[PDB]
């Protein structure tokens, strides 16, 4: 979890969400999957 949650994408998706949560009251981000051959979290796969 700590692995594919280090990248900047994870940090950002949240802050935007929060920024939005504050001003409008809502916010969100998603999770997706695809293949990495070099430095995969596991199974030639990662989550983001």
């Amino acid at each position: 979890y700590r692995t594919d949650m280090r990248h900047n994408t994870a940090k950002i998706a949240v802050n935007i969400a929060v920024r939005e949560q504050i001003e409008a009251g809502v916010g969100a981000w998603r999770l997706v999957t695809d293949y990495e051959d070099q430095s995969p979290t596991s199974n030639n796969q990662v989550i983001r």
């Binding site: 293949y35 990495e36 051959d37 070099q38």
Partner: protein
Amino acid sequence: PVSYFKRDIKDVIDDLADSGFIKIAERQIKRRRVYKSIITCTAVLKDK
């Protein structure tokens, strides 16, 4: 043993690489490459 190298990066060398510790096998990899092209409004000066 067991070390890996970019086919792309070791072009003209391989010969020199085999006369040192040749070995073989193959595998496919998601790399990601970048290309800086130069441009004016009129045409393109340096591509890819």
